[PDB]
């Protein structure tokens, strides 16, 4: 893989690109996953946890996954990148600059994700790289979760 | 508890405050909780899951919780508000405009949260309010999670 040093600022900035990575592997968001997240988080809203009622009453025709559940299931998905950042002492998940849930993930559907570097800035503590992560229902062109992840290189 | 009508934008805008609500109840972020989130999300980084290696090699001297784990545990924390928004048909968790993890939650520590309304805007769909949510280790003045929630009253 191409190697980019966090010390070579102008090289880090070249990674800013509008084209997304290839797709990642696929993960099934089962009702069992949804129910476990509901108990772990405390969010047991019926549109996520009540299949019988959601079939009859939900705008979506079935239960759907929590937005924040799909967000954290990104760690099940390996995004293939053709490059590798090096020459940092440490790498940190600094949070996010944007979280959106444009479309729902129906219970039982698979998700996959792709990404691109949306911005690169030098901060006091190092280099902040913003990676736009899009998580989709497999076969759905509109994202279900958008996450402008902020990575801090130190 | 006062009632603010989503049809009265001057009354909605008057919720904007630099001061936070009272504290919520407390919740224990045990190693068992951290381990389960590791399995559910797929994030098994040793700083969260490996006490022994953490004791000797972790910059924190022990395991800590995933930032996104503390984030989703907000649904365990009931924030007492002195008001209630009404006169809407639907409320939507539209996402977030800022997520940060300023300080870590050591395994076995308790957390609690408070919040304030950061901004209120009229939108085509209805009224957008940004609520700053702060989740802390009980007794720590620095937040462990900052989450600027975006709420859409339709
Ligand atoms: Cl590239
Ligand atoms: Cl920042």
Numbering used by the authors:
A (entry chain A), B (entry chain B): 159 to 312
Quoted passage from the original study:
Shy (side chain hydratase) and Sal (side chain aldolase), are involved in successive reactions in the pathway of bile acid side chain catabolism in Proteobacteria. In contrast, the hydratase, Shy, (side chain hydratase) thought to be responsible for a similar reaction in Proteobacteria, contains a single MaoC domain possessing the His/Asp catalytic dyad in the C terminus and a DUF35 domain in the N terminus. We showed that this aldolase, Sal, forms a complex with the hydratase, Shy, that catalyzes the preceding reaction. Shy contains a MaoC domain and a DUF35 domain, the latter which is responsible for interaction with Sal.
The crystal structure of ShyMaoC was determined to 2.05 Å resolution by molecular replacement using a protomeric model of the protein as predicted by ColabFold as the search model. Although the crystal was grown in the presence of acetyl CoA, electron density for the ligand was not observed in the structure. ShyMaoC crystallizes with two chains in the asymmetric unit; these protomers superimpose closely with an r.m.sd of 0.3 Å. ShyMaoC adopts a hot dog fold, with a central bent five-stranded antiparallel β-sheet (topology 2, −5, 6, −7, 4) “bun” wrapping around a central helix “sausage”, inserted between β2 and β3. The two ShyMaoC protomers interact to form a homodimer with an interface area of 1001.9 Å2 (as determined by proteins, interfaces, structures and assemblies, PISA). β4 strands from adjacent protomers interact in antiparallel fashion to form an extended 10-strand β-sheet; in addition, the central helix, α5, and α4 from the active site housing of each protomer interact to form a four-helix bundle which buries an extended nonpolar surface. Firstly, the central helix of ShyMaoC is only nine residues long, with the shortening of the helix by an additional turn at the C terminal (relative to the already shortened PaaZMaoC) opening up considerable additional space in the active site. The loop C terminal to this central helix is also greatly elongated, forming β3 of the auxiliary domain before linking back to β4 of the central β-sheet; this pushes these residues to the periphery of the binding site, where they form an extended wall of an open pocket rather than forming one side of the substrate binding tunnel. The active site is further opened up by a small shift outward of the active site housing; as a result of this shift (along with the shortening of the central helix and the α5-β3 loop) α3 and α4 do not make contact with the dimeric partner. Together these changes produce a continuous open cleft that spans the width of the β-sheet with an approximate volume of 2895 Å3. The steroid nucleus packs across the β-sheet, interacting with an extended hydrophobic patch comprised of the side chains of Met-289 and Leu-291 on β5, Leu-307 and Ile-309 on β6, and Met-249 on β4.
